[PDB]
Design a protein around this ligand. Structure first.
Ligand SMILES: [Cl-]
Ligand code: NA
Length: 549
């Protein structure tokens, strides 16, 4: 009874809009700048060509073959590890909490651009500290200054607190912006062409404009050089490897249960290998090229401020909110380009949020189709999920909430919680299910048996990379720090560990539940739970699909 796309273009557009966005223009530059720059790229490419792309194609193929969402697909493929799907849902749930907060910030920035003079271009505003000085005069002539862009980002937008211990009050403006963005998402998903042909083209046009401005900026060679040339000693730090590996999985929206849902509506006989490789190349190119735009602007900022290239902005989240607003003021008619850039950011975030929330809602409804979809209950369930995600998301809107955002960024829907899923998705498919059986299924679907790249990537490369990163992170533990200065308390790291474990522990918990529920000897129960029960029964009966095995 699964739906099918139309003309096969809707699927491509949905995928492209779902796995490109804030993870390419916001998270990637800030992670690259936090890890030293060029040293971040080598693990990025190692996890990009040995994994990430194969895992993305695996999720798409699982969705298309099983014709099931993010949960039932693993029930069909391997019942015993069905909890993997549950874990994915948990991850996306947490991702739906903090990933939209960024849009609120963007919305606030947009609501700040409607005035004649951009508020982040002078130090004479009320919120500025006496240490604020204009960057042009900062180079000339117990002595520290703060750039007006960073002053606006910290004092006005974030209203940052001494620490996560002090949350302060709720920022009414940011809370209203978050509520507006949640209302937009809920109205779009609940109830809702050539219009969409310009909602995935304009962001790329603005990216091109930013690229041009950054490249033509004076003193941008230092920024490009900091971005490219790597450092071996930083490659010897496990933090770079784990950050790059988890950025690869975050950007491609894998281990979330969303890409599987997107692929579930594909036709059974549809060459999704090319359509999943071209889009993956587009996503990687978007990230890599936007890195140039961010780092050329950072190099110009460092040249004009007279400071180090790595000491001109925030190592944590908000680099895109300190760098791009600076280059915006360097272009003629700064207000026009500020509005355009923040509209681009809003589009890139809203499309991804729509895709992720749609995947989560589809996966949750598939559990109880006759109760949570029958009648009018679907609307009520979507409203309840959005309201809960909004209320649980107001903890990052308070004055001391920015730190909470980082706790969600580093641990929830990232970090080892991704690896834990990525190891299990590839282990079940390659070893328990069988790489050759899935290759036969792919040969039946796309028309030709692929090369040995996918099989080796699922079997050897991805599990080894995930377990090596896990072991390296555990052996050499670097506690999470905000902007290289803040030290989270014990309970903050405990909360981050709890957020990670909430999704991580779903895989063994469901295994235990299945083992206890099944009767007979343990060996018999394991054999029963490790046997896929008609993985493509719907595809076999509906279409002319060949039976599994
Ligand atoms: Cl990326
Ligand atoms: Na992405």
């Amino acid at each position: 009874q699964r739906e099918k796309w139309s003309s096969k273009i809707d699927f491509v557009l949905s995928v492209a809009g779902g796995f490109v966005g804030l993870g390419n223009v916001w998270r990637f530059p800030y992670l690259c700048y936090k890890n030293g720059g060029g040293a971040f790229l080598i693990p990025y490419f190692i996890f990009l060509f040995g994994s990430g792309l194969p895992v993305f194609f695996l999720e798409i193929i699982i969705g298309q073959y099983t014709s099931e969402g993010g949960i039932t697909c693993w029930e069909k493929i391997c019942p015993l590890f069905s909890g993997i799907g549950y874990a994915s849902v948990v991850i996306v749930s947490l991702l739906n909490v903090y990933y939209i907060v960024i849009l609120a910030w963007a919305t606030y920035y947009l609501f700040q651009s409607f005035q004649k003079e951009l508020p982040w271009a002078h130090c004479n505003h009320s919120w500025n500290t006496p240490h604020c000085m204009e960057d042009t005069m900062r180079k000339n002539k117990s002595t520290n200054f703060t750039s007006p862009v960073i002053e606006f980002w910290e004092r006005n937008v974030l209203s940052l607190s001494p620490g996560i211990d002090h949350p302060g009050s709720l920022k009414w403006d940011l809370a209203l912006c978050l509520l507006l963005v949640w209302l937009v998402c809920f109205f779009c998903i609940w109830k809702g062409g050539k219009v969409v042909y310009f909602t995935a083209t304009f962001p790329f046009a603005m990216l091109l404009v930013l690229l041009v401005r950054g490249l033509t900026l004076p003193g941008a060679g230092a920024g490009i050089k900091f971005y490219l040339y790597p450092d071996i000693t930083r490659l010897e730090d496990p933090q770079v490897w784990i950050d790059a590996g988890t950025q690869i999985f975050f950007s491609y929206a894998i281990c979330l249960g969303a890409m599987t849902s997107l692929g579930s509506y594909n036709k059974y006989k549809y060459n999704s290998y090319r359509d999943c490789m071209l889009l993956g190349c587009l996503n990687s190119g978007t990230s890599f090229v936007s890195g140039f735009a961010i780092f050329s602007i950072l190099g110009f900022m460092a040249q004009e401020q007279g400071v180090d290239i790595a000491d001109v902005a925030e190592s944590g989240p908000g680099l895109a909110f300190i760098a791009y607003p600076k280059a915006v003021t360097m272009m003629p008619l700064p207000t026009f380009w500020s509005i355009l850039f923040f509209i681009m950011l809003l589009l890139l975030g809203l499309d991804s949020q729509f895709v992720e929330v749609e995947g989560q809602i589809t996966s949750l409804v598939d559990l109880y189709p006759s109760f949570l979809r029958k009648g009018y209950r679907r609307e009520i369930f979507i409203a309840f999920v959005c309201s809960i995600s909004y209320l649980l998301g107001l903890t990052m809107v308070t004055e001391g909430g920015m730190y909470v955002f980082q706790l969600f960024d580093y641990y929830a829907a990232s970090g080892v919680c991704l690896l834990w899923v990525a190891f299990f998705e590839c282990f079940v498919i390659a070893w328990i299910y069988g790489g050759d059986n899935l290759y036969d299924g792919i040969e039946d679907m796309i028309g030709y048996r692929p090369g040995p790249w996918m099989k080796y990537s699922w079997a050897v490369i991805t599990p080894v990379l995930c377990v090596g990163c896990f072991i390296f992170s555990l052996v050499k533990y670097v506690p999470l720090t905000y902007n290289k200065t803040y030290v989270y308390p014990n309970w903050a790291i405990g909360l981050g560990w709890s957020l990670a474990l909430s999704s991580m522990l779903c895989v063994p918990l469901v295994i235990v539940i299945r083992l206890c529920q099944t009767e007979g000897p343990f060996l018999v129960r394991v054999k029963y739970l490790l046997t896929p029960r008609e993985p493509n029964r719907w595809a076999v009966e509906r279409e002319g699909a060949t039976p599994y095995n």
